Write a protein that binds this DNA or RNA. Sequence first.
RNA 1: AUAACUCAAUUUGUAAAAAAGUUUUAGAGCUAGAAAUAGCAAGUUAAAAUAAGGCUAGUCCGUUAUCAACUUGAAAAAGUG
DNA 2: CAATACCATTTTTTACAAATTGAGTTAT
DNA 3: AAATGGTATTG
Length: 1323
Amino acid sequence: KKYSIGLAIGTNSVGWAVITDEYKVPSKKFKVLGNTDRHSIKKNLIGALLFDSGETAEATRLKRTARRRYTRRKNRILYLQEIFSNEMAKVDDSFFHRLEESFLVEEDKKHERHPIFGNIVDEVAYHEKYPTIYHLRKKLVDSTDKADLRLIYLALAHMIKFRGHFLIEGDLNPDNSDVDKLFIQLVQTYNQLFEENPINASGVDAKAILSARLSKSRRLENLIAQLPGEKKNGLFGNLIALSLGLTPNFKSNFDLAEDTKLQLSKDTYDDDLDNLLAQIGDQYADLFLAAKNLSDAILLSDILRVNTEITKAPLSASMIKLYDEHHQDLTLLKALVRQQLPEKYKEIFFDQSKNGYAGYIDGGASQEEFYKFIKPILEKMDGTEELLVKLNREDLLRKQRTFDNGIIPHQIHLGELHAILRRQEDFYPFLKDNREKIEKILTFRIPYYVGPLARGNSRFAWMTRKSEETITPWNFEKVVDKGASAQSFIERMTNFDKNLPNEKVLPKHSLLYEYFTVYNELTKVKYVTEGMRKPAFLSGDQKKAIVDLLFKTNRKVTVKQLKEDYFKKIEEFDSVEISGVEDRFNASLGTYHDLLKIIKDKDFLDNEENEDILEDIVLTLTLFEDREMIEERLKTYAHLFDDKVMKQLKRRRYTGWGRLSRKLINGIRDKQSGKTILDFLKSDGFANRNFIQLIHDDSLTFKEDIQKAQVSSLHEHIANLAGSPAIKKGILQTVKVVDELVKVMGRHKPENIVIEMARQKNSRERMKRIEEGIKELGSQILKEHPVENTQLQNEKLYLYYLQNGRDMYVDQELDINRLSDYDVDAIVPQSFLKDDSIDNKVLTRSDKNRGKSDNVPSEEVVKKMKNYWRQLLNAKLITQRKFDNLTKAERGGLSELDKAGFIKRQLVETRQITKHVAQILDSRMNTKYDENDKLIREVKVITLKSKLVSDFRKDFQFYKVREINNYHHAHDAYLNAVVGTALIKKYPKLESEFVYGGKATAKYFFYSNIMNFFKTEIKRPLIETNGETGEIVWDKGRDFATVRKVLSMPQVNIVKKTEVQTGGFSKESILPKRNSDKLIARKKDWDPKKYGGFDSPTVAYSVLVVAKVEKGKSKKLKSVKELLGITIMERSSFEKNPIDFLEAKGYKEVKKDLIIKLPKYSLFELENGRKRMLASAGVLQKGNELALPSKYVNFLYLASHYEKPEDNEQKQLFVEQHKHYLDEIIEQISEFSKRVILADANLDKVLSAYNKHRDKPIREQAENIIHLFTLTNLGAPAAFKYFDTTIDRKRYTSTKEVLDATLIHQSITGLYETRIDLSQLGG
RNA sequence: AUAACUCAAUUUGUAAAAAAGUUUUAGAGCUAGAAAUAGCAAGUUAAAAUAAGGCUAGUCCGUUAUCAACUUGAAAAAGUG
DNA sequence: CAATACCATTTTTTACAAATTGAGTTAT
DNA sequence: AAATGGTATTG
């Protein structure tokens, strides 16, 4: 009867195995359904499910969000055309019709092909008069002359259409009138205070140097160069840093506590300056007044590059300069190339294919790809003197529309938009009467806290309407309830009190929430002086004066402060030792301080009779981020407060939510005492009970009242876990294999389920962290050893850069060409912890400079190096986590208790996800209750870490070569079943730690050697028993034997999950027109032979048609049987009317009741047990698994790594003994590949390659056999090298063979099969 | 194994915005030549599209999750060896 | 037909909630 | 960011 289940949960596989008492995996006979002459079959009960990874929702979200951007922009232009409609009709009554149809070829147009003026003469004139839209924008803001309404419309729409960013708050004037003189206010203002060291400002080029071709950061160097006697990381260089945008550590300058860096563009600034002027005197905020005064003019000096005075359109103006420069520079290049390099000319100005000018303009070639091409050419030429300097500044042959217009803020565009409207309203009454409407089209933007402006049909939407009626930029305030919405943007995402679940958690920053937080910490602090028997609790009256005096005076109260400023100065205990708070209090009344600073009244804060209000001010400050919406919900408390203080309060924003409600903390009462949880926290006699205590104390009513308030699908339940969708698929799927396994085993539940789980992109992150770290350190190491951002994947190199080219342990400089000669020491060593992240890795010359292997780095090191570790800590070149580990010896080091914990954790799974799995399964298997009404545990769910079985394999030579076939997942699921059951059969003490439901040295010893009852020598006999019960746990002579024979089994149930494909319709590339029945219409009317489209759709699923097709002039019907791929785009109509779809496709008399859905991976058996999986309507995949014998597996293992004590003779010799296992392994690929692969050319190439490399080492030949298994791997064909010969993939490019094959429909285990012969369907 | 707090790092989900890219058209190409073709002149800008589309008609929705077969269900999901 | 080869939309900002891992304090 | 099905070209 009795059996167990093993599972191995991955992202692309669940391995499963069924085992019985003797660790044997049984075999059974299962029915075989459908129409073959096979009615049944034998199956070993070991297998795996394979699947393509499930995916994150992000891609889908990003496309959705852009979709909405598109439909909104379209409506901006529509809002504008509607305003223009009635007056544009009088000037030219088809203008908007022939913008709408500009894209159509001349023969699909209703109107004249010339869009603006609807005739050629006037259109040619327009373009030579205004080469760029920028020429026209400028003209229309500067000229006073009445303008063509069409030329007005075009300037407004292009400002409204490409309208720049919403990242600066509020209004904006261009003042670059005095970058010369705004700077020269700063130097007399600083030269008034620092009269000792007066900066020699002759104002030599303040205008130029800040605001030059090259960067901001660089240009500071170039000003402090033309000022003599001045550190650039010094007070005048610090002010100028800020004036640009860079942040300086500013600490040095004034002798202060912490690194103090501002950016004058952050909103954080207003307040942050005053944090510093509180130190140095409000008598030097005129050094940060003359700072903004130049910071204004310089903000925009990278875009705008025209002295504004001479234009109100400095953006369009600059653009015109880029053009004019582009014209003058090009005409020069065209002279030079023709006097100096005539041969090349053609290539550079005609041949698009190459990245010359033609390639830049009419080819597909980047501003960058261009520059690269012609740097070679420009300098093999004595004329490019001033023209090559332009290339390096990136100022050469610039377009106006480019990657770097990212920076233009919407206010700039609004500047010119507003200007034009001021001009032409003087002549167009409707522009006067709609100036504000039109501007609101450019300006309005739905708030992130409002989301889609839906009406009952967006599962994304939360917005409320004060009124049903259409929302427009102009009626949004009056129709959207912005507060209701601003609130539910948050409330729909925030927790309910897990204890009182109809209650919403308080703001993290609520005054009440912070009170609860200290009293909980403070209630379990205890103290001692001499003359006291025991240490006592703090009392009620004691906690109050500590709260009243220290907590409401300092943000942080340090333990020093509690000792000195309390026990000495009130309690008169000159020496007091205290337990429960270790350096400073975790808890703090941060909100009491932030408020009393701004509100300025302790008598109001401390007054209990106005609590509800203060709780509604912090709720208003936490919910909302829109300083305006705050003000509106804060205005009702304007009687109670000073006007100067709403100024402060409105800005006092807060962020974060608690885990507990007001009702719990301070509403709900103990029946007896009538006292709230916070009441007990404030005073609880001599018991001083915690939060967690009061909640579990049967003498109190909290325990049962929480029991009262507590309340009550699978598919749903799994998708609500916190893990990667990729793991959440493996999760669901395993539950489904376990449900099927329980059925094959006759509804009988298992004795046990043993689960276990596994553990350019990160090349930009690293270089971005490397730059910012050194840029912060001010190190010249990237000047001295420049690096792309793709070699920093070499962990030795990356660590070298993350350590500023220094040894992490000794304070030597690290030679960057001797990383070969150097070591990567784990901080917490490998012995204790399996972390391979950079958080535990450290590059040193030798690893022995940490000191002793058997602990954290020496105290020696920790005190010598610490200073430099914090340099890297501030730099973000290490984490607080890394830094804490590195230093641990100074806080005692790795305690024998820590060490045990680290070897226990090598064996017991912590991961919260794997626990949920174990729980899901436990709660799913164990559903019955006994007479007394307690849950009967039929099934035991045992959680193992991978390391156990990985060891076990390495320890009794059950080696896995992952690349041989998909069997290893099933193998691990078996080994997890046996090692699982065997471990709790020997040690029922360990069900505590694996089943769901001097002290350190011993524990440590036990765990280190736990798995020894499998070994014979460390002494121990063949037969192993439980001491107490005397069960059998391992017939060591006979039981490994059964493991061998299970792993040697060739018939393992592999199943690839068949999957209807979903996602994007096709490749996204909008291809040019060609005559080709592959191009796909981007819109109904856009015939792609004229307009281009898409070429490369995804088949959602293939379908088997048996029908007839017309043939010849005659239309004489002929019978067809083939696959038609149904495209993702086609699918919904195919499904709507299966016939009318296929009939419209060509097919006739389509036999409706023979159509078969064949999603991707649908499996087919041909001849010789050769099988193929569908990849598409036209492409097959390798369907067979190659079942290499055990003996060859292990030989390939040991061979591949000869880099492996006295056992390395016996293991290393086996290899040289069985050199002829190679020929025998090659022959076994050949028999296989000849029978099922059918790649005649590729087998010939591997055969030759092999025979050609036979005089090479046994190691080098095993590394490369291990490559050949790609030839034979289940799945899509793929390339691989045998040594230096590549064998490109032999693909399956027709599905015709499967139409007469056997379709095999598999259950999820693959044990239940329906088999269809397609030879019996085709008429 | 669990709770609250503190700090750091991570991952998941949502909303609002921006800049390019690509596509067709418009920006009279000239001269010599029967033509092939040659010489030359030009180039930087715009419009419109950006999943086909869909009804629920919103400034909404349209790429995630879920899916052997048979029987039963709109479905979810149950039954079946 | 087979062998062969080339191709795949990209970047950027702001606002927010949750869970999880792991170094601490207090506990059931 | 591969990997692998769409696509075209060619032998």
